Write an enzyme that holds these catalytic residues in place. Structure first.
Site, mmCIF file in Angstrom:
data_model
loop_
_atom_site.group_PDB
_atom_site.id
_atom_site.type_symbol
_atom_site.label_atom_id
_atom_site.label_comp_id
_atom_site.label_asym_id
_atom_site.label_seq_id
_atom_site.Cartn_x
_atom_site.Cartn_y
_atom_site.Cartn_z
ATOM 1 N N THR A 132 43.732 43.125 37.382
ATOM 2 C CA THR A 132 45.147 42.797 37.719
ATOM 3 C C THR A 132 45.945 44.069 38.002
ATOM 4 O O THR A 132 46.005 44.976 37.168
ATOM 5 C CB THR A 132 45.826 41.995 36.587
ATOM 6 O OG1 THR A 132 45.004 40.875 36.231
ATOM 7 C CG2 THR A 132 47.199 41.491 37.021
ATOM 8 N N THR A 133 46.544 44.130 39.190
ATOM 9 C CA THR A 133 47.397 45.251 39.577
ATOM 10 C C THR A 133 48.671 44.741 40.247
ATOM 11 O O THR A 133 48.615 44.026 41.250
ATOM 12 C CB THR A 133 46.674 46.233 40.522
ATOM 13 O OG1 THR A 133 45.344 46.471 40.049
ATOM 14 C CG2 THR A 133 47.427 47.558 40.595
ATOM 15 N N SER A 154 45.828 46.037 34.424
ATOM 16 C CA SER A 154 44.635 46.813 34.080
ATOM 17 C C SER A 154 44.254 47.827 35.157
ATOM 18 O O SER A 154 43.770 48.918 34.847
ATOM 19 C CB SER A 154 43.456 45.879 33.798
ATOM 20 O OG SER A 154 43.163 45.078 34.929
ATOM 21 N N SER A 171 40.599 43.850 38.944
ATOM 22 C CA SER A 171 41.410 43.752 40.155
ATOM 23 C C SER A 171 40.538 43.562 41.392
ATOM 24 O O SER A 171 39.394 44.025 41.437
ATOM 25 C CB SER A 171 42.285 44.995 40.321
ATOM 26 O OG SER A 171 43.164 45.151 39.222
#
EC number: 3.4.25.1
Lengths: 213, 233, 202, 204, 220, 244, 233, 216, 238
Positions: C1-2, C130, C170
């Site tokens: 996740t970005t 993350s 991601s």
């Protein structure tokens, strides 16, 4: 997780006489291996006939003292009387026991004068159990002061001694000597010693410098 | 900030009558006429739905309301009080279905709804409902018709009338009612007994009629009403 | 996740990836992490999928009623404060990292960052999740003061592409969003549309 | 295991126009046997029975609280309870205690009143109903009971043939289980009669 | 457990298996996993079996209460929000994994709801024990705006992949096709597995069991 | 406007003509108390209340009818002073909760709406009586500008350019209409606010009175403050001079 | 009809003023404070000779140093005395000492106006205590006597009389009492005033007497011990 | 708070002749990562008092909200009474202990600085409720490194000027940047006086790295 | 007659009769005088007795080290309100470690007494208090009534026949500010003497004085403690 308690050290001592009551403690406040402050007396005056001492967790010490101060006035408004040393000692027993399952990490020693005018010293544990005795030492260096107090004041383990009653001049010298001996061995005790004297005249305070390391 | 009364408003009179319920029965008596007829093949419920001003949208608010897939309701008296009784009947029908996994019997729903109507005649700081209910249903291969009055009592009916001129309706119904009537013939007599006290010529917007049978309860469309309404079907 | 949000003169530019993982398996490779709260207010979601979605819907309900009662277009600070009050009060129960970025006719383009602690601070740019831990060096070096709208779209797209390259959590697709006085315009950069960076080979 | 504390096994089977229900009679704590005559199958309405297996307390508690709700149902409604209705009643009773359930697995066996149709089902500790056309089993020797029922059961069986099938399916499965035994009681439910037999089983 | 859902041109096709297991032993060979919510929305179930049933029945009860008050057909987003807000409130203690799908006035809407409360809106979703096998079929053969019979073939192959490969899934394939005007609830769509009929009869002869006590009670 | 055999005893009771008398009798309590004036200028709001001195034994500044709801919001009360202080505390708490939730200072148009809802809540039940107090709220901002609102015992809030509530509010409003407060600066407004008070005040009927004035505008940077003693004497000198 | 907390045009609560009127129906009680101790005297008022005289106890002990005489509604008094007995033991448990007479009377005076309808607990009082109490005991300040009434206004008294003929007994106590009298004179005087106001003649089984002194604890005068002071008619 | 997320490191405090000076770096560390490099950790309470906090920054913003409102609410009355430095410290002692007893503590370590009645005040507050007065104060790693430097100068000279106390802190902040891993070279200088509370903007301590060559 | 039953009922004139009826309770109680200087605040109160054989009622109560009150009206309502005043002062000293300002405490009374006057079944506090206190702003004399409205006064007297005391304080109001401790007490009892009829005057048995200020904390003087204040009197005018 999180610990609600912390060890801050400090040793409090009280000796009762025939017309006086001496309560003394070191002014050192520390945590782990570092000293917080060098000026933090554990002896505190409540009334003209009562002086209390607190050792252990300082967070509980600050709050409990403010609780007693609030309860001193509540008694003064309802009963129209100044609360006696024996009544404060009985009250503290119920306050400490109200927090039975979440106890105060606190060792209290109340020293003052009773109804007759004689010296009275009460000893407390973290939960509320108390008794009246001639002398008691509580705190970090409590195991260092007591054996000397059992010998000189209690006249124990010696064969032929006249058994002399306690006097103010000798008791003041006895307090100053044991805290010097405690500062040499116990790291929590040092900096400066404050002595509170409870007589029929009033409350006296004296400061004597100690080992600062 | 509010409090709430704890004392009953409905009390016993020196004669021995609950005064608030007696006047609640007078509120339904001055309401719109409503009829219900059981016909072994199915149940029919019809009510007067006079909008008066023509500016009113007829299809917006219905007097004939479905409670479940096989149960419906018709009333006489006050509109707002009936609407609360619909929501309560709909909720009680769902609570039964969550426990027993079986569609609620008609007689079992009426008993639960009547208990709510009894509650408001004894609870603190509340008046009784000014509504008499007509409950229809189909279960166990048998059609059902029930009446629930302001007091909280319930009666099983073959044919009954409500609202204004209900005594004239009941006397007209007992002359007109027969054993082993057909469902489609039951709609005819229901729309005719309502015409006994109506005065202003019936249109498909003037009355509302709902039927209940083996297939379930549903409200009849204005097209279906128009066919029955022109004197004959 | 970005997740990423960069502030410019006329408004703000938001960007997020689309990969949501439950362990090592990707449950959704095309997740929309840019949730609309109001007409010009958007947020970026990172952390627990159940927690981030439940709070976002709650703020939409809270600000929605707030906007009508005051009869004025809602402030970005107001929308970020509602996220702050929920993330701080239930900090031991919720696992969320929300970046709130939008526009109001009073202050303009604003970027607020609310991490797991529950604190709130306004920033020029904000990165979270993350995969953000891999682009702290790139963003600090490439960021120029006073970048135009079109430059901020390129700035967000490049930083996300580098983050999705290295981070396992991601990946997927890049979702961009630009908010100004005119309104909200969104575009999606696909598989071939992603900014390619050369792989180290001998 | 909480279920293996008291032991026990309950079995139900379908026939042509008859339903059979069988259960062991052992009541014991862990290893020590206490009582030879322990009731596990309870009557629910002349032609409907429930068999409970698991913790001995919860076996008795659920049966008593279900009878509490059964009688109120039969007084409010002027009809005898349906097998599908009771199934949902047990499912509702067990789910009320979702985060602290009764450690028992109910098995309902009986004929549908007025419609004479057979019915069998078994439920979870939290109350999850499942309907079968062959057999349902619950207890400590669940795996042992499955192996016997999968080989012995036939589609259409008369009361006498169904009795011989359920008896042999219990006895052999019970004899391979340490915590279950000390006699097997079988209730054969017909439209006309209820036949109760206590089988000759191993007492070890 | 293998449950799946797909979105095609006209509506939605939902798929499920029939194997229900207690531990590592099959308890039910034929089990319904496609659940009724409304006359236009159906929902597949996975995870805890008792939690799936009671949560489904409560939402179906609430939406029937909702549709009768509004007087019109309920929406998929209404079914989604009710399941989303409840499962979040219990913090994942209710182990219910639900694949939601139905046709509204807006169009076809598909959702995947997790026990913790997270929801995803996708053209195709898979959940359960054999979801990994079912997703691989979709990631290889799925195409946007496909025919009804082509979409039915796509889901049936996905459920079958979870049946043969995953030990948690087995037996029959159940399908539910919902469109704008037609609702097809095909209970037994495909039966790939069956018992090899017993050639050796083990029927116990009349009087092979020893009886100690007998009591007959007459009925009405 | 007479019926009182019932109908007027409870606030939850309607009269035959469709009026709640309990609210109307609370509106009689505000009419009995002295006039409280306050007008909106181009760059702020200035308040003015005639405080009737019941006894010379009371200190200067006692029984304040000017309150600080927020650091930017002012309050001018009229009616029963007991209810006035309670409504001030509820308004202070409402302003406190807004900053705690959103961060910025509460807009007066929203603050006046929230407090008026609390006032209305006491006009519906038999368990509680309506507030026998009417009050005014005024603030100034860089974006919002000068704003003035008034809330009556029933719970109705309206925006004002110039408002008065008390004994002779009708006599006061006729004097405000002559003023061009839309163009005037708030520094010159103080002189005019003090003027109307002296004209409205009854010398032969009521005893001696004390004047209290308040700032809230560009001059005080948005903060609601009390008028300095230098300007208060200047306003009193102007009002007494034109009394002839 | 009005509420329990309603003020009169005069400036006092009705329920409190009516409670004072209830005392004027009860039996008379005389208490006298002396340097040697506090004495309490009361008439038992026996309605029927079949009733046990030992059953009627209008003088009761709170502690070993405090006694109290009661008048009016005897039933209401037993609730107040029970509260006073608990408060003294609660103070003993906390402070390890005995309460002063003023402190005990103040504790009972706190329960005076603790009555109401709205905004109160389900187990709260509805009406005031219609009891006049005479707390007489010895503490650190010496022998003390206090008078309490339904309003909660407690005050110290040298000689106080409350009951039916309280107004007549008060004027008689003003002519006899002085600062330097003895306890034996206080016992003697109290009997002379009591026999004048009583309907029946003074007898050992007819009256009740108790004394509190700095020397020894609260003592109740027995039938034989009374004869020594009764013989001086 | 059971687990702190974004945390601030050491906070300094030393009283001089006619006021107190408090310094804290503008860093909010997220574990080992230095995420926020521009956040204010020192706040102005009223007109004579100031506060500097260590540990969890989200918990500080809550105390900034409460203490901020308490001052505003007091300034509404204008009765002539204001909260003293000793009063704010006493409230903070009682507030932190109350949440400690509830087993849900605020993860903070405060340094209270104030000047009232011609007297300089310096107070310390733990997350547990431990409070005292000291002429020199330092939190976190400051109590181990910066405090020994503060006690050394105060031993030789108990009463310092405003200039002497300012350069002492700058010397202490340099050492903190050398040996504390969660510190940053961007700090604010907050000073209380009879005139009021004044906080300066971004300031960097000059560092020496000549010892990097004298290894061999 | 039909509006004078509950506090929630409003009069057609725009009044609450029950609050006005509660104001009469203060007039029923004996008179008390409260005055301040520039350093001290003195309360002088008159004691009443039910009989000559009974002792006199307590009229001055202790609240805190710097705050003290003199009550007039209902005794039970006085002690109930006093316990609230004692607690609020203890709460501020427990939390902030500072004496609570008088202006703050009187505002808290005006908040608590307002609640029962607006709710059904509840009644107003039928007691009037004269509050004397010393803080950072100096000496304070406050007047609280049955209605939540409070007064900040230079000198005030409330009770039975308190009009005679109210007129005397008005004629000598300018003298109080520069008046010393000794003479300022004499002004208080001189007003209290005017309330009494021509034949009877002040005695050691019916006069209580409460003094608080910069020099000393709040102390109540009783019988032999009140004699230095009474000795050296101006004597009653004819």
């Amino acid at each position: 997780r999180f610990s609600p308690y912390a060890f801050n050290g400090g040793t409090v001592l009280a000796i009762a006489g025939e017309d006086f009551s001496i309560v003394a403690s070191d002014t050192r406040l520390s945590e782990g291996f570092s000293i917080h402050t060098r000026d933090s007396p554990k002896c505190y005056k409540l009334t003209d006939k009562t002086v209390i001492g607190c050792s252990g967790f300082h967070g509980d010490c600050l709050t409990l003292t403010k609780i007693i101060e609030a309860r001193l006035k509540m008694y003064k408004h309802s009963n129209n009387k100044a609360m006696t040393t024996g009544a404060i000692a009985a009250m503290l027993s119920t306050i400490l026991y109200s927090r039975r399952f979440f106890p105060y990490y606190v060792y209290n020693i109340i020293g003052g004068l009773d109804e007759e005018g004689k010296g009275a010293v009460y000893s407390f544990d973290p939960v509320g159990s108390y008794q009246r005795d001639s002398f008691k030492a509580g705190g970090s260096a409590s195991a260092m002061l007591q054996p000397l107090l059992d010998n000189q004041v209690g006249f124990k383990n010696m064969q032929n001694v006249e058994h002399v009653p306690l006097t103010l001049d000798r008791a003041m010298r006895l307090v100053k000597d044991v805290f010097i001996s405690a500062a040499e061995r116990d790291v929590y005790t040092g900096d400066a010693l404050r002595i509170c004297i409870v007589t029929k005249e009033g409350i006296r305070e004296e400061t004597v410098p100690l080992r600062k390391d | 900030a509010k409090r709430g009364y704890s004392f009953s408003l409905t009390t016993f009179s020196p004669s021995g009558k609950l005064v608030q319920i007696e006047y609640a029965l007078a509120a339904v008596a001055g309401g719109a006429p409503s009829v219900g007829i059981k016909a072994a093949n199915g149940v029919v419920l019809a009510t007067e739905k006079k909008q008066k001003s023509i500016l009113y949208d007829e299809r917006s608010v219905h007097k004939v309301e479905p409670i479940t897939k096989h149960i419906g309701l018709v009333y006489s008296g006050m509109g707002p009080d009936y609407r609360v009784l619909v929501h309560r009947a709909r909720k009680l029908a769902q609570q039964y279905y969550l426990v027993y996994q079986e569609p609620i019997p008609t007689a079992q729903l009426v008993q639960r709804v009547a208990s709510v109507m009894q509650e408001y005649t004894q609870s603190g700081g509340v008046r009784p409902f000014g509504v008499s209910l007509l409950i229809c249903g189909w279960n166990e291969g048998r059609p059902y018709l029930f009446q629930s009055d302001p007091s909280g009592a319930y009666f099983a009916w073959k044919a009954t009338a409500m609202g204004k001129n209900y005594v004239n309706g009941k006397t007209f119904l007992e002359k007109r009612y027969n054993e082993d009537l057909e469902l489609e013939d039951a709609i005819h007599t229901a729309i005719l007994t309502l015409k006994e006290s109506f005065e202003g010529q019936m249109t498909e917007d003037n009355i509302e009629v709902g039927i209940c049978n083996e297939a379930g309860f549903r409200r009849l469309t204005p097209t279906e009403v128009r066919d029955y309404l022109a004197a004959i079907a | 996740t970005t997740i990423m949000a960069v502030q410019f003169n006329g408004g703000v530019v938001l960007g997020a990836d689309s990969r949501t993982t439950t362990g090592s398996y990707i449950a959704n490779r095309v997740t929309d992490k840019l949730t609309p709260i109001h007409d010009h207010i958007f947020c970026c979601r990172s952390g627990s999928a159940a927690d981030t979605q439940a709070v976002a819907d709650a703020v939409t309900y809270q600000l929605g009623f707030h906007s009508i009662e005051l009869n004025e277009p809602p402030l970005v600070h107001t929308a970020a404060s509602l996220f702050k009050e929920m993330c701080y009060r239930y900090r031991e129960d919720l696992m969320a990292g929300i970046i709130i970025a939008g526009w109001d006719p009073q202050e303009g383009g604003q970027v607020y960052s609310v991490p797991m602690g529950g604190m709130m601070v306004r920033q020029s740019f904000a990165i979270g999740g993350s995969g953000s831990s891999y682009i702290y060096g790139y963003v600090d070096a490439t960021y120029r003061e006073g970048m135009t709208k079109d430059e901020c779209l390129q700035f967000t797209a490049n930083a996300l592409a580098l983050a999705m390259e290295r981070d396992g959590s991601s990946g997927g697709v890049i979702r961009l969003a630009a908010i100004q006085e005119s309104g909200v315009e969104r575009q999606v950069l696909l598989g071939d549309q992603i900014p390619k960076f050369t792989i180290a080979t001998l | 295991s909480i279920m293996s504390y008291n032991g026990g096994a309950v079995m139900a089977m379908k026939g042509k126009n008859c339903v059979a229900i069988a259960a062991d009679r052992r009541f014991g704590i862990q290893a020590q046997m206490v009582t030879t005559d322990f009731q596990k199958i309870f009557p629910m309405g002349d032609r409907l029975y429930i068999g409970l297996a698991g913790l001995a307390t919860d076996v008795q508690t659920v049966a008593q609280r279900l009878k509490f709700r059964l009688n109120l149902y039969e007084l409010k409604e002027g009809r005898q309870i349906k097998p599908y209705t009771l199934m949902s009643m047990v499912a509702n009773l067990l789910y009320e205690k979702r985060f602290g359930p009764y450690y028992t697995e109910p098995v309902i066996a009986g004929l549908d009143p007025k419609t004479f149709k057979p019915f069998i089902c078994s439920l979870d500790l939290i109350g999850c109903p499942m309907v079968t056309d062959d057999f349902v089993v619950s207890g400590t020797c669940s795996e042992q009971m499955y192996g016997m029922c999968e080989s012995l059961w036939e589609p259409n069986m008369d009361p006498e043939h169904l009795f011989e099938t359920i008896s042999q399916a219990m006895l052999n499965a019970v004899d391979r289980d340490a915590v279950s035994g000390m006699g097997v009681i079988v209730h054969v439910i017909e439209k006309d009669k209820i036949t109760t037999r206590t089988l000759k089983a191993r007492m070890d | 457990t293998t449950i799946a859902g797909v979105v095609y041109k006209d509506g939605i096709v939902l798929g499920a298996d029939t194997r229900a297991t207690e531990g590592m032993v099959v308890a039910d060979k034929n089990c319904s996993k496609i659940h009724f919510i409304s006359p236009n929305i159906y929902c597949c179930g996975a995870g805890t079996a008792a939690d799936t049933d009671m949560t489904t029945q409560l939402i179906s009860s609430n939406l029937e209460l909702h549709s009768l008050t509004t007087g019109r057909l309920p929406r998929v987003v209404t079914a989604n929000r009710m399941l989303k807000q409840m499962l979040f409130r219990y913090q994942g203690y209710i182990g219910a994994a639900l694949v939601l799908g139905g046709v509204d006035v807006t169009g076809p809407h598909l959702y995947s709801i997790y026990p913790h409360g997270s929801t995803d809106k996708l053209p195709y979703v898979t959940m359960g024990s054999g979801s990994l096998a079912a997703m691989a079929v979709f990631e290889d053969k799925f195409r946007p705006d496909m025919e009804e019979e082509e979409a039915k073939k796509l889901v049936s192959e996905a459920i079958a992949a979870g049946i043969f490969n995953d030990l948690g899934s087995g037996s029959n394939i159940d399908l539910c096709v919902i469109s704008k005007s037609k609702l097809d609830f095909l209970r037994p769509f495909s039966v790939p597995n069956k018992k090899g009929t017993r050639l050796g009869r083990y029927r116990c002869e009349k009087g092979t069991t020893a009886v100690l006590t007998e009591k007959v009670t007459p009925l009405e | 406007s007479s019926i009182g055999t019932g109908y007027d005893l409870s606030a939850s009771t309607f009269s035959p003509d469709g009026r709640v008398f309990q609210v109307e009798y609370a509106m009689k309590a505000v009419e009995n108390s002295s006039t409280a004036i306050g007008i909106r200028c181009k760059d702020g709001v200035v308040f003015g209340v005639e405080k009737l001195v019941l006894s010379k034994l009371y200190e200067e500044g006692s029984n304040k009818r000017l309150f600080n709801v927020d650091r930017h919001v002012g309050m001018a009360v009229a009616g029963l002073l007991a209810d006035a202080r309670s409504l001030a505390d509820i308004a202070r708490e409402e302003a406190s909760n807004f900053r705690s939730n959103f961060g910025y200072n509460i807009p007066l148009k929203h603050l006046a709406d929230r407090v008026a809802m609390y006032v209305h809540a006491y006009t519906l039940y038999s368990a509680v009586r309506p507030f026998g107090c009417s009050f005014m709220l005024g603030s100034y901002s860089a974006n919002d500008g000068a704003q003035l609102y008034m809330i009556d015992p029933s719970g109705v809030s309206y925006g004002y350019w110039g408002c008065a509530i008390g004994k002779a509010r009708q006599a006061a409003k006729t004097e405000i209409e002559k003023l061009q407060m839309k163009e005037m600066t708030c520094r010159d407004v103080v002189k005019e606010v003090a003027k109307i008070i002296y004209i409205v005040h009854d010398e032969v009927k009521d005893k001696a009175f004390e004047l209290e004035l308040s700032w809230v505008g560009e001059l005080t940077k948005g903060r609601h403050e009390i008028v300095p003693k230098d300007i208060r004497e200047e306003a009193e000198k102007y009002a007494k001079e034109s009394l002839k | 009809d009005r509420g329990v907390n309603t003020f009169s045009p005069e400036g006092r609560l009705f329920q409190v003023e009516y409670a004072i009127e209830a005392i004027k129906l009860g039996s008379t009680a005389i208490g006298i404070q002396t340097s040697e101790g506090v004495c309490l005297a009361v008439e038992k008022r026996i309605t029927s000779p079949l009733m046990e005289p030992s059953s009627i106890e209008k003088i009761v002990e709170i502690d070993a140093h405090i006694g109290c005489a009661m008048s009016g509604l005897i039933a209401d008094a037993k609730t107040l005395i029970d509260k006073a007995r608990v408060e003294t033991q609660n103070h003993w448990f906390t402070y390890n000492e005995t309460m002063t007479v003023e402190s005990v009377t103040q504790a009972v005076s706190n329960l005076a106006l603790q009555f109401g309808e709205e905004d109160a607990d389900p187990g709260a009082m509805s009406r005031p205590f219609g009891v006049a109490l005479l707390f007489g005991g010895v503490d650190e300040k010496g022998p003390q006597l206090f008078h309490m009434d339904p309003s909660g206004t407690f005050v110290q008294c040298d000689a106080r009389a409350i009951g039916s003929a309280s107004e007549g007994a008060q004027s008689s106590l003003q002519e006899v009492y002085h600062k330097s009298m003895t306890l034996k004179e206080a016992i003697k005087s109290s009997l002379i005033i009591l026999k004048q106001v009583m309907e029946e003649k003074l007898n050992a089984t007819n009256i009740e007497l108790a004394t509190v002194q700095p020397g020894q604890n609260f003592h109740m005068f027995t039938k034989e011990e009374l004869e020594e002071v009764i013989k001086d008619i | 708070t059971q687990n702190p997320m974004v945390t601030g490191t050491s906070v300094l405090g030393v009283k001089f002749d006619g006021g107190v000076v408090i310094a804290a770096d503008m860093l909010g560390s997220y574990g080992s990562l230095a995420r926020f490099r521009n956040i204010s950790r020192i706040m102005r309470v009223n007109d004579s008092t100031m506060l500097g906090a260590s540990g969890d920054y989200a918990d500080f913003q809550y105390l900034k909200q409460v203490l901020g409102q308490m001052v505003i609410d007091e300034e509404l009355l204008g009765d002539g009474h204001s909260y003293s430095p000793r009063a704010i410290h006493s409230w903070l002692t009682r507030a932190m202990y109350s949440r400690r007893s509830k087993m849900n503590p605020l993860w903070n370590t405060m340094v209270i600085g104030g000047y009232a009645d011609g007297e300089s005040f310096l107070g310390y507050v733990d997350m547990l409720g431990v409070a005292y007065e000291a002429p020199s104060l330092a939190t976190g790693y400051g109590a181990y490194l910066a405090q020994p430097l503060l006690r050394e100068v105060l031993e030789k000279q108990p009463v310092l000027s405003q200039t002497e106390a300012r350069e002492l802190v700058e010397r202490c902040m340099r050492v903190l940047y050398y040996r504390d891993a969660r510190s940053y070279n961007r700090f604010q200088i907050a000073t209380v006086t009879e005139k009021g509370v004044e906080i300066e903007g971004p300031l960097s301590a000059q560092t020496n790295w000549d010892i990097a060559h004298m290894i061999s | 007659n039909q509006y004078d039953n509950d506090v929630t009922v409003w009069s057609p004139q725009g009044r609450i009769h029950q609050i006005e009826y509660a104001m009469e309770a203060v007039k029923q109680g004996s008179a008390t005088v409260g005055l301040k200087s520039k350093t001290h605040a003195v309360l002088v109160a008159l004691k009443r007795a039910q009989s000559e054989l009974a002792a006199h009622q307590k009229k001055i109560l202790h609240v805190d080290n710097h705050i003290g009150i003199s009550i007039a009206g209902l005794t039970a309502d006085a002690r109930l309100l006093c316990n609230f005043m004692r607690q609020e002062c203890l709460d501020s000293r427990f939390v902030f470690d500072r004496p609570l300002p008088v202006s703050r405490l009187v505002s808290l009374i005006g908040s608590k007494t307002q609640i029962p006057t607006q709710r059904y079944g509840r009644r107003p506090y039928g007691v009037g208090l004269l509050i004397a206190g010393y803080d950072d702003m100096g000496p304070h004399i406050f007047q609280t009534c049955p209605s939540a409205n409070y007064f900040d006064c230079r000198a005030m007297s409330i009770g039975a026949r308190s009009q005679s005391a109210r007129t005397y304080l008005e004629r000598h109001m300018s003298e109080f500010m520069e008046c010393n401790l000794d003479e300022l007490v004499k002004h208080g009892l001189r007003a209290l003497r005017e309330t009494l009829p021509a034949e009877q005057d002040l005695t050691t048995k019916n006069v209580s004085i409460g003094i608080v200020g910069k020099d000393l904390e709040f102390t109540i003087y009783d019988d032999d403690d009140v004699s230095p204040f009474l000795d050296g009197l101006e004597e009653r005018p004819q």
